[PDB]
Amino acid sequence: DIQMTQSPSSLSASVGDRVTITCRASQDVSTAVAWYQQKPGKAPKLLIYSASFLYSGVPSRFSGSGSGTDFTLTISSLQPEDFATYYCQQAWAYLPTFGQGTKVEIKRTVAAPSVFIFPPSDEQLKSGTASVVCLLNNFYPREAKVQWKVDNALQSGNSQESVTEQDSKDSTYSLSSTLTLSKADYEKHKVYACEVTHQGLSSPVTKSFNR
Amino acid sequence: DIQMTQSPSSLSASVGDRVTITCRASQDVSTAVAWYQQKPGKAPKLLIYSASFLYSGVPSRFSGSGSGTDFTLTISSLQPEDFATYYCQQAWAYLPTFGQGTKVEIKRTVAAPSVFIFPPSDEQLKSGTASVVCLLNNFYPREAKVQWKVDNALQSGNSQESVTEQDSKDSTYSLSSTLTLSKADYEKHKVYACEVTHQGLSSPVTKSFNR
Amino acid sequence: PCGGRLNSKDAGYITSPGYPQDYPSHQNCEWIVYAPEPNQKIVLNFNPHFEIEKHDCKYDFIEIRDGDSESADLLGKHCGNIAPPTIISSGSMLYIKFTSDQGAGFSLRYEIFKTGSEDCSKNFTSPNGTIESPGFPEKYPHNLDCTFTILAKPKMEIILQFLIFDLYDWLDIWDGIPHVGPLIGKYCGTKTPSELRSSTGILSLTFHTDMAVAKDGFSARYYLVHQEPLENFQCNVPLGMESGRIANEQISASSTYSDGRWTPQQSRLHGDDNGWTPNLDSNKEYLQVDLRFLTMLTAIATQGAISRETQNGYYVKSYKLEVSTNGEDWMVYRHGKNHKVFQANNDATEVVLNKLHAPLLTRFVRIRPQTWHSGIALRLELFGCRVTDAPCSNMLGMLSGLIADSQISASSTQEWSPSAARLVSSRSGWFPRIPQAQPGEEWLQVDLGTPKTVKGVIIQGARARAFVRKFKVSYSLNGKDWEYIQDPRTQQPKLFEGNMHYDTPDIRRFDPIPAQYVRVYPERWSPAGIGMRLEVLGCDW
Amino acid sequence: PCGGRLNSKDAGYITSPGYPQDYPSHQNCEWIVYAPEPNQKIVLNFNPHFEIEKHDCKYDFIEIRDGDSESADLLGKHCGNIAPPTIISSGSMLYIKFTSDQGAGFSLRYEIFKTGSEDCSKNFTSPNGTIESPGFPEKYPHNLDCTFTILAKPKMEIILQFLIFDLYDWLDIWDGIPHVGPLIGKYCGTKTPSELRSSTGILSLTFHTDMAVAKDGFSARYYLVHQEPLENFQCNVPLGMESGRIANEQISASSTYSDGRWTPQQSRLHGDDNGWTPNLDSNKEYLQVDLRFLTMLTAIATQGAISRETQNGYYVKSYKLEVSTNGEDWMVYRHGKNHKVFQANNDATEVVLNKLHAPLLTRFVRIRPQTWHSGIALRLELFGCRVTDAPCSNMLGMLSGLIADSQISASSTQEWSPSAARLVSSRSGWFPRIPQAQPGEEWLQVDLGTPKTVKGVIIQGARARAFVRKFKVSYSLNGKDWEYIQDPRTQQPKLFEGNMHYDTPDIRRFDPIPAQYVRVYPERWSPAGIGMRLEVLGCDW
Amino acid sequence: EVQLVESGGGLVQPGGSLRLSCAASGFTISGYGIHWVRQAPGKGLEWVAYIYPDSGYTDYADSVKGRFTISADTSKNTAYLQMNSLRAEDTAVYYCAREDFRNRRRLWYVMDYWGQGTLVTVSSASTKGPSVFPLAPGTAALGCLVKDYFPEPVTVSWNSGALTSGVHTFPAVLQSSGLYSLSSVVTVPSSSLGTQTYICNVNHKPSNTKVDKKVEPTH
Amino acid sequence: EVQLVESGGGLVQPGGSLRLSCAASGFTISGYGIHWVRQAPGKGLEWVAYIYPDSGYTDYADSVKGRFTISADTSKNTAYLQMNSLRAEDTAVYYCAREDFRNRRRLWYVMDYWGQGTLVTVSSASTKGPSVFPLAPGTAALGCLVKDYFPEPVTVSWNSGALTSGVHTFPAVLQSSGLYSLSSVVTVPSSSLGTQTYICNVNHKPSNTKVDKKVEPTH
Numbered sequence A, B: 001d002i003q004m005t006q007s008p009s010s011l012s013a014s015v016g017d018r019v020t021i022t023c024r025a026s027q028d029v030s031t032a033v034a035w036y037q038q039k040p041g042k043a044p045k046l047l048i049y050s051a052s053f054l055y056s057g058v059p060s061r062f063s064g065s066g067s068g069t070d071f072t073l074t075i076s077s078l079q080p081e082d083f084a085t086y087y088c089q090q091a092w093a094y095l096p097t098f099g100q101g102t103k104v105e106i107k108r109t110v111a112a113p114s115v116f117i118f119p120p121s122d123e124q125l126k127s128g129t130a131s132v133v134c135l136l137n138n139f140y141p142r143e144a145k146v147q148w149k150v151d152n153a154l155q156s157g158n159s160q161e162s163v164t165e166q167d168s169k170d171s172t173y174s175l176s177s178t179l180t181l182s183k184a185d186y187e188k189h190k191v192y193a194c195e196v197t198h199q200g201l202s203s204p205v206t207k208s209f210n211r
Numbered sequence C, D: 001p002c003g004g005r006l007n008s009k010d011a012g013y014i015t016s017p018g019y020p021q022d023y024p025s026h027q028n029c030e031w032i033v034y035a036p037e038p039n040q041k042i043v044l045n046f047n048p049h050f051e052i053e054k055h056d057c058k059y060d061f062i063e064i065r066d067g068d069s070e071s072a073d074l075l076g077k078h079c080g081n082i083a084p085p086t087i088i089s090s091g092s093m094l095y096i097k098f099t100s101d102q103g104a105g106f107s108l109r110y111e112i113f114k115t116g117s118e119d120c121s122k123n124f125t126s127p128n129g130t131i132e133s134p135g136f137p138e139k140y141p142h143n144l145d146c147t148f149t150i151l152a153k154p155k156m157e158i159i160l161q162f163l164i165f166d167l168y169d170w171l172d173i174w175d176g177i178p179h180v181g182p183l184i185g186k187y188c189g190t191k192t193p194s195e196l197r198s199s200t201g202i203l204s205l206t207f208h209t210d211m212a213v214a215k216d217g218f219s220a221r222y223y224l225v226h227q228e229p230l231e232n233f234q235c236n237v238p239l240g241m242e243s244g245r246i247a248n249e250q251i252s253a254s255s256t257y258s259d260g261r262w263t264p265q266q267s268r269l270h271g272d273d274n275g276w277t278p279n280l281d282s283n284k285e286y287l288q289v290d291l292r293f294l295t296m297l298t299a300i301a302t303q304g305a306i307s308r309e310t311q312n313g314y315y316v317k318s319y320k321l322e323v324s325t326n327g328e329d330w331m332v333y334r335h336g337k338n339h340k341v342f343q344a345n346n347d348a349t350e351v352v353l354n355k356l357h358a359p360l361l362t363r364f365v366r367i368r369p370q371t372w373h374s375g376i377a378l379r380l381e382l383f384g385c386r387v388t389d390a391p392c393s394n395m396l397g398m399l400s401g402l403i404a405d406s407q408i409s410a411s412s413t414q415e416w417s418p419s420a421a422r423l424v425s426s427r428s429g430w431f432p433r434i435p436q437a438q439p440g441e442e443w444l445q446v447d448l449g450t451p452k453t454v455k456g457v458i459i460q461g462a463r464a465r466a467f468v469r470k471f472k473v474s475y476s477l478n479g480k481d482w483e484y485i486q487d488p489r490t491q492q493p494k495l496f497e498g499n500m501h502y503d504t505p506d507i508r509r510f511d512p513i514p515a516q517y518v519r520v521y522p523e524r525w526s527p528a529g530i531g532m533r534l535e536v537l538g539c540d541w
Numbered sequence E, F: 001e002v003q004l005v006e007s008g009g010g011l012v013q014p015g016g017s018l019r020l021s022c023a024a025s026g027f028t029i030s031g032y033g034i035h036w037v038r039q040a041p042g043k044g045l046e047w048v049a050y051i052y053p054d055s056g057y058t059d060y061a062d063s064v065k066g067r068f069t070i071s072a073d074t075s076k077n078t079a080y081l082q083m084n085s086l087r088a089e090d091t092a093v094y095y096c097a098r099e100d101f102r103n104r105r106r107l108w109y110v111m112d113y114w115g116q117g118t119l120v121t122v123s124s125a126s127t128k129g130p131s132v133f134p135l136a137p138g139t140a141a142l143g144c145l146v147k148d149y150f151p152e153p154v155t156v157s158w159n160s161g162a163l164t165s166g167v168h169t170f171p172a173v174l175q176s177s178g179l180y181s182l183s184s185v186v187t188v189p190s191s192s193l194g195t196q197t198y199i200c201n202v203n204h205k206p207s208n209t210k211v212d213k214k215v216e217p218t219h
């Protein structure tokens, strides 16, 4: 059964660059190779079939080539929309097989995060536990520290972070950090601070509140 | 003054892959382009001059091509030794200029970390402060959580992590985490635990000690 | 029928078939008498009224052998009218054979003989305990038969390592209760026993010493450690070649190259020093790994090697996979009808990872190169996980011995030793009375000895090679009330898949149910009959 | 010499030059009399002994104007033998001009006139304080001249935002003390003042109200926030186009396209809605950004734009850079002799980042497209940082007003107003007595008013356009004892670089030293003479 | 309008069975090839099975052959994937995709339209519906906090799909407790607060929860 | 053996001056081109200046032209980089590199050998030497803890260069206190403890510290 092997498995590049990604069938597969594009949380879309034919609606910046066992997909001028994982398939054997995928991230200039803090809404306070959320909006690159501080005291890994994939328009990231505490813990204290550190910020920014 | 622009700016691939990296001069520069290899914490080494000529001692898997304004460097079969940042230079104008660099990481199978814990040596205890270090050896991939626990209590960002670049032989990573406390804090407690989490580990591994 | 195996805890008689009536002509019996544990011995006392044909014991005679089986030492070969003298075991087993080809025959009494040696055997509950050969650090006593057992709570692995080990005389480690659970190793040199991690619940050592010149002995140490695997957990973890959790001892080969520079121990993925190469390149060489415990195998990763002496590249291009639960009965992985040949490497340094399409439950693994470039040289990783990595999925004690013989019942045997039903441990298997029975009529039953949550079973065949192909399962709290596991599609009892081989076990999971007694009903099976070994999976409420 | 500017805190006389001797023919004087703050007014009282030539005041006369400069309202134009009536200011300044072309002349008394209006002006220390137009939320009183000042500790930025703002009548914000520090904006509409962050130490508002029909007024709020930049800190941070810290108000252009769909406010890097396009494509159009405070500029990033209506791509191919500290005096960035043309974009979506080879200290920035494809369309980011981002590098108060006029001394003026020496604030510059003096002989001196650590200075030229090219620096605790900063290479006093332009300031750093008084000694300079404005950088011990 | 809508996904005990469905709209599934393709979380695409309804011709990937049966019912213009003897490695999003091969050799085995997929979770844990709190506020941030649920996924829209610009819905994070939680948030102009209403639309199909929470900010 | 060894690097106040040196060994630097190339931490290579000693011909990158002067002294076979009016963006590792252009057009401006570089740090902070503690223990881990120093770098070898296999020296991390700290560690066989000695070789040139610590493990 025919194995497909893609390279590189991930890469990053700047809007405007000419990107090229590679695919090797483990046996002669003629020109029966297709390429699909998968954007985050969406179903994949066909780009190219029979090695070099563009599918309807696919912009002319995409193109493909090869035969036998070596196939390449080129983007001639990467756009932010093109952030996605790209897969080759062989359409030669009785059983289709896909390559392992190539993740294409985007490089861009440093962008500073907008920070917002969120207190727990009464509705929740009723249920016992309490969730304070810290929002870092639209920054780049992805590296960023978010230290919580309860009464000026550095807190543990009882916080949780989540990050978004790169935005398809501005290529930035967003991040949420949530700290969960009990009735007894949240009620008993007053000073709750979120301190964000990030390359694009000249100095640490702090957002905080009281009950 | 001639600007050089490399793409992609980073990529990862598997030992055995054929990698290709690209360079665009901002004006006709003939075949006067050179490529250098920089390994972590070392000085760069010349690979290729005049666009396609191999320098002495450079293995035949490297090759280059191009003219005018488009230049490519290919590795035909990536080895672990080839982890490095690669730079193009133009050698045409009166003033040399380098491209921004392309970082080549290596993909490999999951490898589980060996953990070791280190107590503070008397010698230090004398100076007042106290440093407990946690060692995670030779794992992959780089993602890994290292939560400290003082008397079964999750600790803050008064710990510090450092990671190594990929090992040039096995492509793995290593990580140290250090927690610093005062005389009064270390002396007063007994249970010190380092709990490591990592993909290659079926369950969290804990290494700990007492005074 | 005559013959059989007898627990000497009860004193009993053994006589020739009709005694004191003349014994049948042309017919041979054989009994094994045995004590509970190697500590005790067996004494035999013959009745003085003894009559076997004379001549020179060429035809009729009684033979007693020291230990077990026909090849043990001849304690005595007797006939005529003079009974044997009292005979005492050197171990905890005797073998008796009466052979016939006229005369009243013989009668004997057996019982356990007591030497006065200690009951040094210690059990272990403690989280941070240690164990050693009594008298340590000074020399260890003569004639010692001791069992050290570590028992563990539900989700806690036993870690056991050794500080020193020097020693006819031996130590053996058991994946359960001694001489019931599988053996994992017999140690008796200067080389110390490699670290052991075990998720069984039980781990036991058996120390045996002789009369002659004691050595330094052994000291070791153990930890119990908690293990919570996640929900979001995939059974694709590396098993220990690169990390070294698979220790050198565990790696072996059919043969190795003459200069000693390409050993089994160099077959670790990404090793910096050559790799394993056999004495002679052919497709009947293998590298073997003994995982020690039943482990799920889901993937194999392989590499070639570059000579450190000469910089020449060598690599296997394709291989086959043999697995086994005991190191004796082997199965070559299949892809439909024929053997599966895996495509391996195309240079000396890339890693090529082959996921098994069918995950395998096994203990020993063999890689057998089929084609290669310039020579056979391997480095290797294995991926998988342990059975107990899934929620509420503990082995409930058929394999280990934690479910005693007296808790295993069968509809009908053709003989009996209940220990023969045990997953892996057993050297035979459970056969019914009529080998080729009627479907849904024959069954095999475990008494868990308490209400448990039961989440699956692991079915194996039997060695006369045969195995169940399909089965049903029923359960009970009581013993007389029985529900079958229902398929919500057919609304008839669900038909499970059995095995495709007599050794390589298969694990079937089902929705959680309460039960203290569980039953398995063969529906289809192999030509030779209904062979079966079995284990049950679950946890406490 | 006659004429001059007089503080009315002291009552003083002003007379025609020789009074009561006949005044000189063919010669004109002019004085400005002024009160400390807009709250107070000025009254003039002429002596009755007044003699100017008659006719119809065609030749000799005294003119008094309401406010300042010759274009202010004519309060009265007098001659003959009848002195003017008492004249009272409508503001806090009068302008007087005596013109001549025989007669005893005039004499007057001046002093501050007091209206009885309040001293509503509040200072602010508090971390979380708020400020508003008195009477809020109800209507604001008539005739109000009020100053609200926020003072801040060393490393703390003042944040100032506005909740409502509705209002002849006006509010203006100052980067320091009112009418000394630079203006940052005069607001008087419905549109609220955009957020302000400031690392100066001082920020002040000036509220002015009229007699006629009050509006809803204004309410605002302020925070002081700590800022610790690191050691490992590089001055390449984005300044606020994409993030919006540069507010819409701050962005402006030479012109904009007719349909209103390509405004200045759309020139933000990565904006989803077209970009800025001028009314007509040529190389004399510009987009401008008012950073509001002196900021280091280290890089510019630019983009084209794709029309949302028609999907057509437009982009600037090259541009020039004009900077200015006041929005009036401009400098085109240079690369050696001639203007630097930056290479910009080659499609409508890539970002192309140009690092200045020479970092620039500036307030206003202008991008001037030179070539383009299909049309001019920009989106833009600016990178840099603030002067105060380096350790111990605070502006010590020349720019703001925190170092009073009476603390600035000069070797020799050609006039005097010490406020003319101030970095940026000043509208002229310090000139010596003899414009073309001898090197190392002329100097300019600040009295910090306390021992400080001094880490540098910022030198600027003067507007008569001239500037220092090289200088030395000396310092003192006392006033009479002086060390020069030494070059450890020459072991002579170190020769610093001055300016290459009369407006665009330059920052020179030196090893930390103790000093309460600092001096700067011009060594080389520009043709026109020694022009200089100045500021000193350091911190407290 | 070709549409493919998968359904049947959810929580299922190891060993158990589950049946996925792919409703075709816009076209008649007979005379096409219908493929199943799955994607384990965070990993790549794996082809599973296919069926050509006209002929009845089906085939399967080795990893599922034996356990899965594909079928079609052209009257209902739907296709099915009966799954049996499931295990943890079957956890994944399953997609149906159309292949259009008739008269186009070049397009053989090429999958030209895909559905949005349905998540199958092979776990012993129990269904638990979420609890949905507000995150109350020239730029403002407001969001919803969807806490404590199992299994994945939950979907969040704002103003029933009308509000999309500025929306950021996070990946769920597994809690210590064994449940999931995510947040959705959107940044709007802070001038239009008090005028414009902002309701977020939470939906967790595995536990039949369909909540709509109204997000809103001394005398 | 061509060798290029840079020296002169260290801490220097903003505005100050510093002078780097590149000792050539093995060849006569006249008749070559000598280039300076710098690399700000974590960023790329930037060409700075060059000199052809025979002719005296020199040139400079715009970002440094004005502030830096390159020179050579062929009798001492060394080249120099006088730097003035320094600022934070001058912080970087500086490398000298040889160009060999005579009779080889193809090799013009190609830099065929480089030195190992010297770190220049433009900071107001103060020099502080490190404090070097041990990290005491079929596989064992032992290391050194080099705590509290400024500026970078520190170098660590083991057994004076003889022990290299298994060594992992970490990147330094900046502490809250303003100082640096790293650890070095090496994994050996745990059989050979008590026999084999293990000393680590710390060295912080900016503060003239050259320590050697001996790492070693109730009656």
Ligand SMILES: *[C@H]1O[C@H](CO)[C@@H](O)[C@H](O)[C@H]1NC(C)=O
Residues within 6 Å of the ligand: C121, C122, C123, C149
């Ligand atoms: C362990 O405890 C005792 C004494 O060691 C012994 O009878 C047996 O081996 C173990 N316990 C039982 C009865 O399972």
Ligand SMILES: *[C@H]1O[C@H](CO)[C@@H](O)[C@H](O)[C@H]1NC(C)=O
Residues within 6 Å of the ligand: C128
């Ligand atoms: C285990 O060892 C002894 C008791 O046998 C005890 O002193 C020691 O603290 C224990 N170790 C721990 C706490 O795990």
Ligand SMILES: *[C@H]1O[C@H](CO)[C@@H](O)[C@H](O)[C@H]1NC(C)=O
Residues within 6 Å of the ligand: D121, D122, D123, D149
């Ligand atoms: C602020 O305080 C007072 C009253 O507001 C006023 O004299 C002056 O404007 C400030 N203080 C001084 C004297 O600097």
Ligand SMILES: *[C@H]1O[C@H](CO)[C@@H](O)[C@H](O)[C@H]1NC(C)=O
Residues within 6 Å of the ligand: D128
């Ligand atoms: C500031 O406002 C008031 C005092 O004016 C006070 O009640 C409030 O707590 C202060 N806020 C803080 C703690 O920053």
